[PDB]
C-alpha cells in the first residue's frame, strides 16, 4: 500500500463508457518511456459487469502494432479496489472520479513499489482542473516519469 | 519566446562547478523518452569563460555508449540568455539559481515551440524545494514529458 487515496462512495456502474488517458505517471522511468513499455496502456472503454467486476478495453503497442487488449479486473471487499491476474497479481485502485468528466486511478504491485497512475477524461480535451487533481494526487507518490497527451494524439490509436 | 522566466541579476561566474540534472521536462514526448532522445543530456560541469561565455560539459547516450560532449554557449546582451550553434541556433535561458544548491534552465528553439527544461542541483540529493521551484516554473509551460532521477542514478554516467 503506497497508494492511500481511494474514492469513498464509488459506484462502478457510473464509470461505464468511453475514457481518454489524458496523462500518465509511473514510479520507474522504464515503465512508461517507450511505446512498448509495460504500463503504457491507453484506456478505450470501461465495462462494469452486473456482478460488479470491471472489464477494461485498452490499446497497447506490443510488436510494432497497436493491439486491442481486454482485461478483467475482479472486485474486492473494498469498492474502490480491484484485482488483475498476473504472477504478482496487480491491484487497480480508483482514487477519485466525478463520473461525468474525469477519473483518476493507479495500478500497483502487491510486492515491489512499482506503480503507475492515469488521469482519464471522457472527451479529447485538455481538462486543466482534472490535471490539477492528478498533480495533487501525484505529490504524495514517488513518481519519476509523467506523460501527457494533446487532443490530436488523444484521437489516434496508441496516441500516435 | 515561450519562456518568459529569466534570472534577474545573474552572475554566471558563480554557476561554476559541478551540477546534477535532478529533473527534466520537454514539450514533446520524443525529445526525452529514450536514452538516445535528442534532449536527454545530463549536465556534468559548467565552465564560464573569462569573456562570459558558458562551456558546458555533459553526457549523452549516442551510439549505445554514454559519450562526453562539450558545448559552448555564447553570451548575448541579456545576461540570462545564451546561444548554441545549430541549424536553428538554440537558445539557453537561466530561469533561477541560488548558485549554492539549485539552478533552473531551459533550452528552446528560435522557431518551432520545441522546449526542454532542467532542475540542476549541486549534490546527488532529492532537493524537494528546488523541485517545487521547477514545478512552479513548469506550470507556465506546455510540457508533455517530465523525468526525475534518484540519488543512485545521479551518481552513474548517463543516469543508468
Ligand atoms: C479502472 C481503470 C483500470 C485500467 C487498468 C489497466 C491495467 C493495465 C494492465 C497492465 C498490467 C498487465 N501487465 C503486467 C501484463 C502488463
Ligand atoms: C546552463 C545550462 C546549459 C546546458 C545546455 C546544454 C545544451 C544541450 C544540447 C542539446 C542541443 C544540441 N542538439 C540539437 C544537437 C542535440
Amino acid at each position: 500500500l503506497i497508494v492511500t487515496q481511494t474514492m469513498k462512495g464509488l459506484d462502478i456502474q457510473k464509470v461505464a463508457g468511453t475514457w481518454y488517458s489524458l496523462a500518465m505517471a509511473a514510479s520507474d522511468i522504464s515503465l512508461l518511456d517507450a511505446q512498448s513499455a509495460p504500463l503504457r496502456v491507453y484506456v478505450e472503454e470501461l465495462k462494469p459487469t452486473p456482478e460488479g467486476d470491471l472489464e477494461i478495453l485498452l490499446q497497447k503497442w506490443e510488436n510494432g502494432e497497436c493491439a486491442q487488449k481486454k482485461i478483467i479486473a475482479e472486485k474486492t471487499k473494498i469498492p474502490a479496489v480491484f484485482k488483475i491476474d498476473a504472477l504478482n497479481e496487480n491491484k487497480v485502485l480508483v482514487l477519485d472520479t466525478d463520473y461525468k468528466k474525469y477519473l483518476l486511478f493507479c495500478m500497483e504491485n502487491s510486492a515491489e513499489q512499482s506503480l503507475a497512475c492515469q488521469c482519464l477524461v471522457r472527451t479529447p480535451e485538455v481538462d486543466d482542473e482534472a490535471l490539477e487533481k492528478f498533480d495533487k494526487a501525484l505529490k504524495a507518490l514517488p513518481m519519476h516519469i509523467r506523460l501527457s497527451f494533446n487532443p490530436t494524439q488523444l484521437e489516434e490509436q496508441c496516441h500516435i
Side-chain angles (χ1 to χ4, degrees), chain A:
Chain A
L1 271 147
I2 300 210
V3 190
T4 60
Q5 306 177 57
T6 41
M7 168 92 184
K8 295 227 211 179
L10 175 75
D11 170 12
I12 28 76
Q13 295 309 333
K14 298 167 102 155
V15 304
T18 309
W19 293 95
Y20 290 69
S21 294
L22 170 63
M24 27 194 100
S27 54
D28 193 323
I29 288 154
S30 80
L31 306 169
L32 284 177
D33 63 6
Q35 283 156 297
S36 94
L39 266 15
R40 194 99 167 241
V41 286
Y42 310 90
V43 178
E44 175 190 305
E45 190 187 318
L46 293 179
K47 312 184 203 209
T49 66
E51 294 76 2
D53 286 6
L54 194 71
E55 275 169 28
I56 301 139
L57 292 214
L58 56 93
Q59 294 161 4
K60 217 245 147 286
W61 198 270
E62 265 191 359
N63 62 250
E65 297 161 26
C66 179
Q68 308 304 303
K69 313 285 269 70
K70 184 192 224 152
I71 295 186
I72 175 96
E74 333 195 48
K75 80 182 184 178
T76 70
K77 246 75 262 202
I78 300 163
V81 183
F82 293 90
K83 62 206 161 196
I84 312 157
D85 257 282
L87 316 54
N88 19 267
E89 197 122 24
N90 295 122
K91 250 172 268 142
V92 177
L93 302 85
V94 177
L95 315 214
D96 192 30
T97 180
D98 70 358
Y99 311 109
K100 64 200 198 290
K101 315 228 196 92
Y102 79 91
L103 188 161
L104 306 174
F105 89 82
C106 297
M107 44 205 158
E108 88 171 28
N109 215 299
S110 296
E112 274 266 306
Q113 208 98 306
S114 202
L115 151 76
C117 307
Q118 304 201 353
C119 181
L120 300 179
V121 289
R122 291 294 197 172
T123 54
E125 222 155 19
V126 170
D127 185 339
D128 280 345
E129 218 213 340
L131 285 180
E132 279 162 11
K133 281 160 176 64
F134 187 52
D135 275 1
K136 270 58 258 206
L138 261 34
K139 70 161 181 292
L141 304 171
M143 297 326 219
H144 291 98
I145 183 165
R146 182 183 192 273
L147 314 158
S148 68
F149 300 96
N150 68 27
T152 301
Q153 298 167 319
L154 285 174
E155 279 296 281
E156 307 291 329
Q157 291 203 125
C158 288
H159 288 16
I160 252 78

